[PDB]
Amino acid sequence: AYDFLMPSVNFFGPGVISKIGERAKMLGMKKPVIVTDKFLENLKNGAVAQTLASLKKSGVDYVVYNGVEPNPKIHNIKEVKTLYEKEDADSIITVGGGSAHDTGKGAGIIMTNGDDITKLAGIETLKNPLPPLIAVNTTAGTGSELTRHAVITNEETHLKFVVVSWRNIPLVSFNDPTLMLDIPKGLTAATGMDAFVQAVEPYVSVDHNPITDSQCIQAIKLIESSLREAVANGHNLQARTKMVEAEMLAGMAFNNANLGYVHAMAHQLGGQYDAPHGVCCALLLPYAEEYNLIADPERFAELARIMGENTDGLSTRDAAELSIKAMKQLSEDVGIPHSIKDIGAKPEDFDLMAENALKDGNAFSNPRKGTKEDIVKIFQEAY
Amino acid sequence: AYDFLMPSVNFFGPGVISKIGERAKMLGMKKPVIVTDKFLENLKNGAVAQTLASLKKSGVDYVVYNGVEPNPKIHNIKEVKTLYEKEDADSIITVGGGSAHDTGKGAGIIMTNGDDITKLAGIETLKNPLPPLIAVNTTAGTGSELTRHAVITNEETHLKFVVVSWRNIPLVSFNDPTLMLDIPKGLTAATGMDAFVQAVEPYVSVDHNPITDSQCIQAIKLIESSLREAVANGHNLQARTKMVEAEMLAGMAFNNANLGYVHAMAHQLGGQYDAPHGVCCALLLPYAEEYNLIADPERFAELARIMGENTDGLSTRDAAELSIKAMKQLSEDVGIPHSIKDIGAKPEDFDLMAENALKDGNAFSNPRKGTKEDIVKIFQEAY
Ligand code: NI
Ligand code: NI
Numbered sequence: 001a002y003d004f005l006m007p008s009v010n011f012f013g014p015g016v017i018s019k020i021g022e023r024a025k026m027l028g029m030k031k032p033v034i035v036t037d038k039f040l041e042n043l044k045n046g047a048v049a050q051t052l053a054s055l056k057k058s059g060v061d062y063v064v065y066n067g068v069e070p071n072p073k074i075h076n077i078k079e080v081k082t083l084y085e086k087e088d089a090d091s092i093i094t095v096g097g098g099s100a101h102d103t104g105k106g107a108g109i110i111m112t113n114g115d116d117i118t119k120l121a122g123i124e125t126l127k128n129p130l131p132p133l134i135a136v137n138t139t140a141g142t143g144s145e146l147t148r149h150a151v152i153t154n155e156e157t158h159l160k161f162v163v164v165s166w167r168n169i170p171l172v173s174f175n176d177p178t179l180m181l182d183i184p185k186g187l188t189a190a191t192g193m194d195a196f197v198q199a200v201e202p203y204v205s206v207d208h209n210p211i212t213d214s215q216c217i218q219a220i221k222l223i224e225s226s227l228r229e230a231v232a233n234g235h236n237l238q239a240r241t242k243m244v245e246a247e248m249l250a251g252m253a254f255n256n257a258n259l260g261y262v263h264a265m266a267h268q269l270g271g272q273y274d275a276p277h278g279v280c281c282a283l284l285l286p287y288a289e290e291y292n293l294i295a296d297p298e299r300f301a302e303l304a305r306i307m308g309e310n311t312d313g314l315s316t317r318d319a320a321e322l323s324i325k326a327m328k329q330l331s332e333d334v335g336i337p338h339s340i341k342d343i344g345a346k347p348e349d350f351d352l353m354a355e356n357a358l359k360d361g362n363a364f365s366n367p368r369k370g371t372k373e374d375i376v377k378i379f380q381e382a383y
Numbered sequence: 384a385y386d387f388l389m390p391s392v393n394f395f396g397p398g399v400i401s402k403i404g405e406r407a408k409m410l411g412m413k414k415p416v417i418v419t420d421k422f423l424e425n426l427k428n429g430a431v432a433q434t435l436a437s438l439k440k441s442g443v444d445y446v447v448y449n450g451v452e453p454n455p456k457i458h459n460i461k462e463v464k465t466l467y468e469k470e471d472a473d474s475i476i477t478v479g480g481g482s483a484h485d486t487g488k489g490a491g492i493i494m495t496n497g498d499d500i501t502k503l504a505g506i507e508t509l510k511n512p513l514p515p516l517i518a519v520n521t522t523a524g525t526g527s528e529l530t531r532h533a534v535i536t537n538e539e540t541h542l543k544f545v546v547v548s549w550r551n552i553p554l555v556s557f558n559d560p561t562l563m564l565d566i567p568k569g570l571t572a573a574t575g576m577d578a579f580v581q582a583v584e585p586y587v588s589v590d591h592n593p594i595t596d597s598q599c600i601q602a603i604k605l606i607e608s609s610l611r612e613a614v615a616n617g618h619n620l621q622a623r624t625k626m627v628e629a630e631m632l633a634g635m636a637f638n639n640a641n642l643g644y645v646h647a648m649a650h651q652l653g654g655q656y657d658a659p660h661g662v663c664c665a666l667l668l669p670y671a672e673e674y675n676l677i678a679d680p681e682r683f684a685e686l687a688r689i690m691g692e693n694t695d696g697l698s699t700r701d702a703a704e705l706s707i708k709a710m711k712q713l714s715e716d717v718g719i720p721h722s723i724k725d726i727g728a729k730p731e732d733f734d735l736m737a738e739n740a741l742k743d744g745n746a747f748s749n750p751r752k753g754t755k756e757d758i759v760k761i762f763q764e765a766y
Binding site for chain 1: 384385386387388389390391392393394395396397398399402409510549552592593594596597598600601605625628629631632635
């Protein structure tokens, strides 16, 4: 009736990378495709270079794929899957942010099943599972290394459809804090807000449960205390670790109870202006939730306490505001723009972009379903 | 460096059973051994009868094993594994309490690897994993359907050794609240305390982490509010559900940070007097933790708040007591005996049983390592 979908093994803390090399060995895998963006291939902090070697070190082969695109295309999947057909892979290893992992998952399902991303779009339509996937992740925000979602972009009506199948879930997650030093200010603030959005969205979600609620708060608790630190001293590993924790505890929950509107709205803005996922999420949250108050502000009371607001003066509805206050404040501390106008949207675009909220699968888990009116009026509120 | 080990799919709420039949089908399995005790085979509330049929209903075979013994023996494993060699199994399904699941896991590992429970005892010594295991569980306490532990008993020195390998972890967990109506007063109080012990033990544990801490409290939060209910109105499903939640949220955490002494001590008493695991755990907890105070009573402050104690008057050490008070009170509400004397132990046995605490692997995760003296003095305190 209600399922809890998490990866079977998740490694954490420093060494987690090397240790997953060992676990990729002890799992009996030989020749995998590595899926990543440009930056990491080019760079060599943690890079791909330090992994490929660490991968060969515990006795295992390798072949990389550079050309991964932000907003993973149906083309990238075909390019990277065919790319390894020449080496006949058994495991897949994705290094990078969200955009990387979704592709790996794309190649994944299609590498086993009938090669057809949209035939495979919807809920759990696949019969076979993806080839053992190991998600080495470098962002502190998106939960994709654990998540059962791969969203693949496709340039026909420039559609963005969803493969929400369980047999996407990776076999092992790995989060080495050190691969996340790569994140510079701008990006740790972006992903760091994204994760946190992912945490409140399900915490108020229609389909939240004990487990969710639980992981969701501690995630925000960990963000309050450790986010701003990482944004200043990106080098501070201790905050870079607990931020990594947050991102997963957040993942755990948002995977199992979905998101509300903040994501449904911000998904549209992210691929109709190509504005970054995390910032368009941060800039929208306080208004998307200020709306959500009426239905369940009893829960924001927690969101607030988790923010470290002393709410024992306030009643339910009024405390729920102080949470919106602190949410909004936090973003202005990590240097997210305060209004949408800055990101460069336009009021003439609002009626169109809002119709597409009805279409985003994630929207159904909002605690309070809203008329075409009030949701456009949220975009105005966003201004 | 730090791993998080949970099953890949866990179902919950009513229907979870039938739904796992579907998932056993959609996974492409044909002929499994079912592992259970007497009671459930004999009985037919949820029984095995309702499962075997529900299993055949989604197109899959079946063969049961009745003779599972409390404190699973090395003999039971051999009996049930050979039992299905005649039908050549592909999946395994265990229905029942902890004693059931440990056996299923035993058969499991040995059904793939060199048939040698103790050759396979220790940490992660196995190379291959167990045949896909699905743990339908009927107790509200032991986490075994998720846990990476199988402890197999063996009558040579009457040793009780541990197969603490990850490749034990089941492929799917299922918790249908309705299969837990079978639990009568005495047993829901026993397991219900056991789970809760499992929750504090890691919450103070040396190797606790954010995820642990998180799941651990909500587990106790859910126990406070819903345990006593289930013990009175065993028929009350709503409390029987949130109790089922607790038991796993507890599992999640105690699997990843181990336990302290309460378990290390109570394990000995459970197989040197054959007294029930849960009650010998409940009767010991307040004293095992009253000792633990000095090292970290800052955390009991939470345990307490999670108990619903208003602790904002008290300082760290004194609040930590009120938690011991409430822990002790809770057990006397669900009708656990207040002293060990009642269970029928003896002071002459104490020096012997205490030496065996040094041997219990779980003991190493106690926040405060204790001399042979103070731990025997805990048994006295237990009196
Ligand atoms: Ni997101
Ligand atoms: Ni136990």
